[PDB]
Design a protein around this nucleic acid. Structure first.
Lengths: 255, 255
DNA sequence: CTTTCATTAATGAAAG
DNA sequence: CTTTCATTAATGAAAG
């Protein structure tokens, strides 16, 4: 039972994450950038009702806060099913165009896997839950991601924005990847024989024996939980000799 | 009066040309070629009536002869005006595809002109009339260019074909250019100081003085007429210091 | 809903 | 009139 031995590490038990060792992020704008305020496209009541619960939860979690800002981007009503359960999707393309570019450091999967020796065949795969939301956004960079939220009868005054790294921001993957690398630097040092692959929120721990993987996984989950990250208990693939990672089937050190 | 001093050289006085020194041409087919017989698209009486006179003249001139051949290509009703005066245009693309390719030796105008010294500034431009028709076609290669000719009430039995190099045949320009080069080789030798440019049927004689151009032009016209070629008396540009050639305005050795 | 890049489908020009 | 290459105009896929 891992779900029990590591309360903090699992999203199902530790609650929403928060990377306590990471300074709130400041997002640099391009030299000539000026605020852009895109109007919110009218939203059908159905779309709005499907989205409402997610927005209320984020507000409850403090991931969204009311605000008044010169920046504004459209929120989009996106449903994966045939016509059920919506989810908010923000179009941040106009903001992305105004944010200074950074060097893409996230390695492509193929290259990331090459760094996997045939020796280590005991794998553990972890999927960090709501990775981006774990990184705080400095108050100065928060107004940048504002959007309008209407609640007819009575609700929010108008705009809401993120206090965490959001979905849709071009630099989120890279910023998260680098942040987690900084938080796990020590762990890599205390476990020289282990092999840890990081692909944004997708982690692969590789050990030589089942015992090392056991203790390796315990130490990792332990560290992640203490750092404020949360792994998905449901998706977790523990000490298997065969696992699914980045769209690959790892078996006998193949692929 | 040149129109008078050189009866044979002008199309207007010497009649249809015939390159007497040139052996009738044999057209080699590609190794795998087999005869293709494309049906004649129905022709409106108007188109047919507009074309008839040209066909009768060619038959009278012996440029077209009746024939029975496994080859056949469509004749096209083409009128340049708004809707008047037609002219026969044969679609020889299927025949062209079956004829063995030869090396394109006709030089592009730009390069042909480069070979023009600033010294020679007295020009004579000649346009050979019905150049292709001046080259005979060997009887063996004649069936290849057959087409159908209908004359309702009563006329030709069915097919007609050319006894001369025809329009529409991909190799005509090159074959004509090389043939005329062979016929004018001696003339170039007897007139070392003259500069003769050949672009298929467009000729440019360049001399140093007006007198050389006078005698140069007389000798050329004389030779052309004796060889069986015919220059256009109407278009002829004699011993001018400025002339139009290949879409260029030659003046003071410019362009 | 808008934006940007692909892939496919129409027309227009050149020719024999 | 049919063929082949261009240029332009429609749609379809990917995304935020």
């Amino acid at each position: 039972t891992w779900l029990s031995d590591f309360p903090q590490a699992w999203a199902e038990t530790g609650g929403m994450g928060l990377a306590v060792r990471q300074a709130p992020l400041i997002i640099p704008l391009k030299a000539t950038s000026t605020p852009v305020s895109i109007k919110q496209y009218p939203m059908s009541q159905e779309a709005r009702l499907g989205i409402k619960p997610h927005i209320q939860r984020l507000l409850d979690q403090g991931i969204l806060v009311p605000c008044q800002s010169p920046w504004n981007t459209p929120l989009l009503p996106v449903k994966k099913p045939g016509t059920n359960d919506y989810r908010p999707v923000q179009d941040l393309r106009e903001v992305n165009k105004r944010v200074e570019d950074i060097h893409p450091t996230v390695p492509n999967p193929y290259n990331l896997l090459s760094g996997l020796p045939p020796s280590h065949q005991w794998y553990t795969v972890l999927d960090l839950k709501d990775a981006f939301f774990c990184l705080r956004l400095h108050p100065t960079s928060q107004p940048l991601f504002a959007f309008e939220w209407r609640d007819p009868e009575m609700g929010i005054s108008g705009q809401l924005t993120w206090t965490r790294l959001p979905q849709g921001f071009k630099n989120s993957p890279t910023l998260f990847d680098e942040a987690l690398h900084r938080d796990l630097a020590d762990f890599r040092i205390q476990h020289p024989d282990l092999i840890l692959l990081q692909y944004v929120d997708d982690l692969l721990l590789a050990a030589t024996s089942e015992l090392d993987c056991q203790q390796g996984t315990r130490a990792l989950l332990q560290t992640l939980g203490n750092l404020g990250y949360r792994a998905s208990a449901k998706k977790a693939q523990i000490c298997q000799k065969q696992v699914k990672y980045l769209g690959y089937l790892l078996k006998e050190g193949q692929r």
